[PDB]
Design a protein around this ligand. Sequence first.
Ligand code: DMA
Ligand code: DMA
Ligand SMILES: [Mg+2]
Ligand SMILES: [Mg+2]
Ligand SMILES: [Mg+2]
Ligand SMILES: [Mg+2]
Lengths: 348, 348
Amino acid sequence: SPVVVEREREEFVGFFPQIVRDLTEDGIGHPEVGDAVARLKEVLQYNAPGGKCNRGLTVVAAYRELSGPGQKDAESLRCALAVGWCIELFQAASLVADDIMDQSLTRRGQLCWYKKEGVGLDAINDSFLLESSVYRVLKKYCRQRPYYVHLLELFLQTAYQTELGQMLDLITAPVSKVDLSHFSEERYKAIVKYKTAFYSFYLPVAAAMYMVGIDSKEEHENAKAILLEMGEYFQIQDDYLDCFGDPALTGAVGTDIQDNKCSWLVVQCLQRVTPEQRQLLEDNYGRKEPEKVAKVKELYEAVGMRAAFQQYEESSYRRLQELIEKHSNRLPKEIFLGLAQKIYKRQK
Amino acid sequence: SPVVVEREREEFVGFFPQIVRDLTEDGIGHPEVGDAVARLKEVLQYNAPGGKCNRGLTVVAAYRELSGPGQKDAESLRCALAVGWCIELFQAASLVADDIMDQSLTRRGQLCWYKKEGVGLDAINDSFLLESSVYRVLKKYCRQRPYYVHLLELFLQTAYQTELGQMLDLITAPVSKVDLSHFSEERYKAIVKYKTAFYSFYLPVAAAMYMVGIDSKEEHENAKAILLEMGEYFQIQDDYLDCFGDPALTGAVGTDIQDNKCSWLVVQCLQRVTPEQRQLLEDNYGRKEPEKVAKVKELYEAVGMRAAFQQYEESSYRRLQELIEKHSNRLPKEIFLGLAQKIYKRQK
Ligand code: DMA
Ligand code: DMA
Ligand SMILES: [Mg+2]
Ligand SMILES: [Mg+2]
Ligand SMILES: [Mg+2]
Ligand SMILES: [Mg+2]
């Protein structure tokens, strides 16, 4: 619902300054580090805000859907928000770095933080600081809470798992050398499972779970299960949308197969190819030349990725409900649906 | 004592493979991330080993000096080692990054990890992974221990405080632009307090403290106090040794005032200077030209940094004992002395 969803969004966004203050207020005057904390302020402000927040928001709504009447106090609510922004801070820490390693130029419609004159490789330390920030926020709101340790362990683990997924990326698709040798189906799936699924989907729910008291490992597996299908489909979708979508396209309806990106289409292609066609891709791909690009895509419609998607979004749903069945015994299915209704959308 | 000190050292070093195994054993076969964890192995092995280990060792000896007869079991001892290697892992995470941001070439006599062909900016993610490693080790050995949270909070905080000290460095002495404008006495002192003191001296003792049960904040301040004088003197010393030391000089008796390094001598200089002399430094400094370098140093002996040091190491000791007096009420002074006997040395 428009009214609720947005009322939720307005509170989240309206919450950012607070976090900013939390992180720097008493630091800005510090006769020793004041210059430093003052610079931090800028980093937060340049990088943390500006996404959609559907990640951070997920904690909130979940908590909302999980807590009991006793746990909807203002205090409890603020934490949920606070823990929400944490996921936001963490991902920013991530992205800032994805940017230096990719020699990217743009992000969220602003220039990469590293590209700002006067910054440079320094951003390397800046993302370390954005990552630190996450734990400073937790210490701040949840330190005197039974679930403190769980949440600490949970963020630290996800951090490692994404770094691994990242690591795999960095190794598979080196952005200065084409090699489609390693663009496999399981590598793509493995890169996706780690680099984003964990932190994009599991993390916000798991957080809310531990905050209501569900600390049961095997209840974490039932979530992890459904949630992992979810974020996988999601990555795929972003993947499809990038090339074949448009009407109402969420910001930058630009694109980037110029970057030898291990995307689903490429992979789904190389399985549908002939040996000529493979060397076709093998050449023209990862190329910032309008001509090659057109060819690349020709190839995709030439191979018919279009229906491959419709048939995939196809099974993807179905499967999910079944998974909703096997794994939402104790948890409120409501969760995974609302999440789903904002994730499955379409675009043919 | 040679015999003890070294017996302690041999166990520490002999402990590394274990950590390595801890970190990768069950990961190396993983059909999804195996390529990644296999690469991790290399990162650990290239970067973590090779220092002196006096940092990690400090936890051990302290624990040894603090525990009671009940707490010297093998198990307890392994943790101390394990927590020791953690400080080692963390600093490595640090250095690997100090290297990319400084465009350095060498480290611990090997080439910077980032300079290895095939690596590059990727190391940015590698140090993230070295940092993750620290918490994986803690989860492994101290998860079922009363002091788990304290140690988790302690490493996370230090991480932030050094990053700040780093941040200050990065801003004060930008390695591609001389500017001695900001080389002040308090900036140097502030950079030193944060970038190294905290993690080099306070951290290993504080860790041992919490492991024996001293979780008292104000007992952490009494340590912090003495310890901070310590690591400050230490940085200074490294600083002096770099330029004016030699006979038996610990590895690379090379040097680096070619890098516009905010070192103590520079600062101590700019306070002893004339306005001519200042522009002298202002020019020749941060220069990889044998001629300038000689001038630079001429200046230092020209100004007489030599005795300024002897007079500083001078007060530095004294002060310490006094601090040992005001602050080792409840803790065993033995600690800070042994630490001191390996730190104060001299070299005129
Ligand atoms: C969450 C994370 C590590 C994203 C990096 O992905 P990417 O290198 O494929 O680039 P982009 O910023 O376009 O996703
Ligand atoms: C512990 C830490 C962040 C060291 C970086 O110091 P540096 O940039 O002054 O260079 P070096 O490696 O010579 O100390
Ligand atoms: Mg990128
Ligand atoms: Mg990338
Ligand atoms: Mg350096
Ligand atoms: Mg530096």
